[PDB]
Each structure stands twice: as C-alpha cells, then as structure tokens.
Design a protein around this ligand. Structure first.
Ligand SMILES: [Ca+2]
Length: 674
C-alpha cells in the first residue's frame, strides 16, 4: 500500500507507506513550514562555523489536494504570498517519493516533520563518531573538518578551539549524509546537497530542515535490516571486492625516502611480521613550514626524496609488497600542476574572476574544478600517469570536505550546494582512473571525506584523524560508531590508522595505545599504520622488540582470517551486507543490541569489543544469546553482560561455536600457542 487519506473539509491528512505512518498534517499540527534565512559562514580553514540568520519561518496550515498521473499533489499555503507544493508518488522500483517545491527561490528554508514513535532508534547519517543511535539529538549535515577532541568538556577540544575553532563537536564529520534508517524498518534518503539539519530529539516526530527552496525524499521498507541494506545499496551503490593482497598483512606507514622504507620493511619482515605494503605519503616531497613538516602538494614522484622508486616498486612487488602513495584535490600554487591548471582554466574561481587560492599555513593550493569536464579528465590523467603507471598499488585519496563556500565553479551551481557534493565527485575521479586502466579489484584507494555516491565510488573508507588518546569522542573508541554508522548508510569497508594520528598540544602516542589499536585493527578488513603529524613524538611500530613481536602476533591473527574476511567482503559487494556489522543485524529481537556503540560483529560469527581505555587488565561487554567461544582461551560463554581478562594481544573477541568457520577460529589459539 501507499495509503493516503485527505479530509478537504479541514485541510488535514495522513500518509502510511507499507503500514508505516510517515506524514500527519492538520491546522493545529502542520507537517510543513517554509521561510528564508541567510547562511552566516566563517570557514576557519575547514573548521566551519555555520549559523542561520533566520528571517522567517511560517507554518503552511492550508492544504488542498488534487490527483496527478503517478499520485497525489498537495498545494500548501498560508495567505496568498506564501505557498509550496508536495507531490506524493511511487518511483520506478516502488519507493515512496516526496517532491517538495516552494513558491519561489526567496523561500530558501524548509522544515518537514515525519511521524515517529517514542521508542524508535535511528542510525546512519553518514560517518558519525560520537553517536551511533542518533535518537535524542539534532545532527547538522555539513561536511567539514572532523574536530580535534570533539567535546567542549575536554581539554584538548578547548585548546583546539582557542587556536582555530578546531575543537569541533559531537556531530562534526567529513562524511555526513542525508540518509537514515529507522527501527520501523525503513530508510529515508534525501537527494539534496544543501546544508541540512536532521533533528531526532522529539519523541513524536523527526524534523528535517533544509536550506533550499525544494526537496526530494525517498523511502523504502523491508522485513529485516539485512534486506533493508540490500535495498539501500541498490539505490546508492555497492563497493567492489578488495584486491587479494589487502588480506596478506599490514601496510607500513613510513616517511623519509627509499632507504628508510627498505630498512623498516626488512626489520619487520625479518622479525616475522606479515607485511603487504609500504604507504609513503611524502612520495612527492616535503615542505618545511613554521607550523612543521608537510607533504609537498604536487602529485609526481620526487626522485630526489625517493631515488630509484620506479625500479624498487618492481622489486617490492616481486616480493609481495605493494607501494601506496597520496593525492588530494588541491594543487600547490608554487609548483607544476597548478601552473598547468591555471593555463587551461582548470581551477575554481573567486568573485574577482581570478583563480581561487586556498591558504593552508604558509602555502597556497589551487582548487581543481572537478565540475569542469576537462579539468576532471585532466586530473584523472594525472592519477593514471603519475601513480598507476608508476606501479602504485594504491594511495590515500585525501580531502573532499573543504570546498570553500565562496568559490565559483564551471557548472554554475552555488558552492553552498557543491560543497557537500564534492567528496563523492572526488571519489568518482579516482574510481574512473581505476576503471579506465583495468585496475578495479587490483588497486586500492582509501578516503576520509564522503558524500552520497561514495557507496559506489570509494573503494575503502578510513576514519580520518583520531587523536593519539583514549577519549571517547576522538580516540580509539570513536572509530566503532564511525564504522557502524557508515555500515547503516551503505558503506561496508572501513579502517583506521593504527595508533591514531593527531599529535598536538602535548598529546603523544604511547606504546600501550599502539598495541591496543593494533589489536583492534587485526579485526577489521585492513591493517595500516600512520607515523602521525609529529613522527618523533609518537611510539612507532618498530620502537622496540616487544612492539615488533606484537605486530608479528597480530598480523598472523589477521592473515589467518583471510578467507573468512574475503567471503564477508564478497557478500558486501554482492548485496551491501557490511563487513563490520551492528549486532542487531543478526540479533534483531535483542533490545540491548540497539544501543551498543563500541562493539560489533566481524562478519556473521565474530564478536569484537575493543579495549578503548588506558590501563585495563579486563573488559566488560555484552554477548547476545548464542554459543560463544572466547578466541584466546576456548572458554564457552552464554548471553549476557560479561567481564573478561584482556591483556594486550588477547582482545575481547568471541566466536560462534556453530560457525562453519569454527575450525579456522580455533586455529588462532593453536597457532599462537605453538
Ligand atoms: Ca579528530
């Protein structure tokens, strides 16, 4: 059913869709307000402060129906100079389609309420780092820097705020998305890319605010969450299968040239670490600033830093070791590529008509205009010729979240609209470089920024910048909700920097933190380290023999899991069943599973609850009702809350005794105890 009942007498109605109550509207309780405002934006180098100067907000209490071909058309109004229309219909696959159009452009605000029940939980909205269940809070959806500390009640957040509004808050992300899942077992997806605010705080309704004069929303229902994700991914996209070599060990994050890479590779391999790769973000050079060292933003191998890299890649490849690089969608203004781009009008413009230059702290970057058809093809050629043809097995494809809101773009669309759409456009560029060279399934790139479409075009998500700390909102813990939220928004391939990244204000990565994070990432689809922004302040993967031996232990764990991970990843590609899974995908009747944030299922059969606090010798977690086996002792466990010993190297991990993979999981204890 698509069940729509109007009562013309008092301009009131309801809409059910497959029995779900979606809209209710009366004169005393409207579902639609329109109005106008002026965006008050201060960029803070991507740490956006974005507040409305609200001018009007008007409830449209009058409503008249008429019937169009595909379904119903409601003409909402309030007096004669204030109106909008809502078309209700079903699209080609049977999804409820809502099309809102305000009277005129000057009415650039919309507020739509959807009926809800008090008990409903809400998941998704892209990649969320403080909350997984969203119910109870509002969520602005504006891609930005993710924040350093992210909580106004922690010290580092206060310091970062003092410096460049860089502290952030609970909702800050580089991959927000106007898409969510309800426990009435539907999803809602909004097409628009304007600023939005999705407010899940009221018991009886969700309120969706859009900063635009029009809106399109789509909904679809299903009988299970698994089936709901199959259907969401059919709309948004499915990721490819990962290259077979991802499963063969850890990718070492290393800076300092060819020699330094070779040495550390040998140190780790000789101590029995399983190593599948080298990731070297300084492949293109180093820039010295007052603010510290940086990567040189010109996407061409620097043989003065990385002598004989061309030939050394071949040798590494012949020994089962890929080489991975770094690119982002800006080009340094003092260097070749930005020069070539200005000469062909490949850059975004400013108001004065010049080429837009972004200040990054003692250098500028030009903004490659991905809306310019021929700039897009040119930058794609840069990736082909300077990375793929060089023999790179992959790279970090960084940024996407800081298109400045006063750029002027070739397609003529406001930067206030293109800003949120930038990341998936950047993803597609990368994706098509691979497509056009036959390299899908063979080369792997990974991204932090995302948007609608990243579900198709980004081959892997990375959780971006965590602090080198144990905080909930920006530490090790914050990665879990990030993976689970994305899972619920149709992206099922997710990893993090082993040890975290952000080293500021006296934060330093300890040995303990590196090792705990190693334990976590051994139970995700990819292991990759990062030196951090200040390398010498942090404990590194080769810091001492015990550390090296720990990596040997845990990369053995990870490589043993290979064929199980590979099946999960095939299932992700085939039907949107994500690799890190909220517990309620398989335990739908267990109420306590809907509010978990910091544990997940890896595939169907492994439960993981990573230790996310300093100084722990045990850990408390939840097991749903099943026959569970603790991975390191073989101890049998039933459902319920449990506390287990959890020294480093023996993370809280449990497997299903009835699993067809059970013999592989029992081999972890067996292998490590001989
Ligand atoms: Ca952060």
């Amino acid at each position: 059913l698509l069940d729509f009942q109007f009562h013309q007498n008092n301009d009131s109605f309801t809409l059910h869709f497959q029995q779900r109550l979606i809209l209710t509207h009366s004169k005393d309780n409207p579902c639609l307000w329109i109005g106008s405002g002026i965006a008050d934006i201060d960029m803070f180098r991507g740490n956006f402060s974005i507040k409305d100067k609200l001018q009007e907000k008007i409830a449209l209490t009058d409503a008249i129906v008429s019937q169009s071909p595909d379904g119903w058309l409601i003409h909402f109004s309030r007096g004669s100079d204030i109106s909008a229309t809502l078309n209700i219909s079903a699209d080609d696959q049977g999804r409820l389609l809502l099309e809102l159009q305000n009277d005129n452009l000057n009415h650039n605000r919309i507020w739509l309420r959807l009926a809800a029940q008090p008990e409903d939980h809400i998941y998704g909205c892209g990649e969320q780092f403080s909350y997984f269940d969203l119910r109870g809070k509002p969520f602005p959806l504006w891609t930005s820097e993710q924040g350093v500390g992210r909580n106004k009640q922690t010290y580092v957040t206060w310091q970062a705020d003092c410096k460049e509004n860089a502290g952030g808050d609970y909702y800050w992300t580089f991959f927000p998305q106007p898409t969510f899942v309800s426990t009435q077992k539907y999803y809602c997806h909004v097409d628009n890319s304007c600023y939005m605010n999705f407010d899940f705080s009221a018991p009886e309704y969700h309120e969706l605010a859009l900063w635009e004069d029009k809106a399109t929303l789509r909904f679809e229902c299903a009988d299970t969450y698994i089936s709901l994700l199959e259907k969401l991914t059919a709309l948004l996209g499915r990721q490819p299968e990962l290259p077979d070599w991802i499963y063969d060990g850890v990718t070492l994050g290393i800076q300092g040239g060819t020699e330094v890479c070779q040495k550390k590779l040998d140190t780790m391999r000789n101590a029995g670490v399983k190593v599948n790769g080298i990731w070297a973000q300084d492949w293109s050079g180093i820039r010295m600033t007052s603010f510290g060292k940086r990567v040189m933003w010109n996407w061409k191998w620097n043989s003065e830093n990385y002598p004989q890299l061309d030939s050394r890649i071949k040798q590494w490849n012949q020994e089962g070791v890929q080489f991975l690089a770094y690119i982002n969608p800006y080009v340094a203004s003092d260097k070749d590529l930005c020069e070539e781009a200005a000469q062909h009008g490949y850059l975004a413009k400013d108001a004065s008509g010049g080429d837009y230059l972004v200040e990054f702290g003692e250098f500028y970057g030009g903004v490659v205009d991905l809306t310019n058809p021929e700039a897009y093809a040119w930058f794609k050629e840069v990736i082909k010729k300077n990375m793929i043809e060089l023999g790179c097995g992959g790279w970090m494809a960084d940024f996407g979240e800081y298109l400045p809101t006063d750029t002027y773009l070739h397609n003529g669309v406001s930067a206030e609209i293109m800003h949120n759409a930038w990341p998936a456009l950047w993803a597609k560029c990368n994706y098509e470089a691979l497509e056009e060279t036959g390299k899908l399934g063979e080369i792997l790139f990974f991204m932090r920024a995302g948007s609608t479409g990243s579900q198709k075009y980004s081959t892997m998500m990375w959780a971006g910048d965590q602090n080198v700390d144990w905080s909930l909102d920006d530490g090790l813990a914050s990665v879990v909700p990030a993976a689970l939220s994305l899972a619920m928004t149709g992206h099922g391939l997710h990893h993090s920097d082993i040890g975290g990244y952000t080293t500021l204000f006296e934060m330093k990565r300890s040995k303990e933190l590196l090792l705990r994070w190693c334990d976590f990432s051994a139970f995700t689809p990819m292991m990759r380290t990062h030196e951090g922004n200040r390398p010498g302040d942090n404990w590194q993967f080769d810091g001492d023999a015990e550390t090296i031996a720990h990596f040997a232990r845990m990369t053995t764990v990870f490589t043993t899991l290979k064929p199980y991970l590979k099946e999960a990843v095939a299932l992700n590609a085939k039907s949107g069943l994500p690799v890190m899974r909220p517990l309620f995908l398989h335990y739908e009747d267990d109420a306590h599973t809907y509010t978990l944030k910091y544990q997940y299922l890896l595939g169907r059969d492994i439960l993981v609850a990573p230790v996310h606090e300093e100084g722990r010798s045990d850990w408390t977690l939840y097991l749903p009702e099943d026959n569970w086996v603790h991975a390191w002792t073989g101890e049998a466990f039933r459902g319920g809350e449990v506390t287990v010993n959890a020294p480093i190297g023996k993370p809280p991990v449990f497997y299903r005794a009835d699993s067809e993979w059970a013999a592989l999981f029992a081999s972890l204890k067996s292998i490590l105890e001989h």
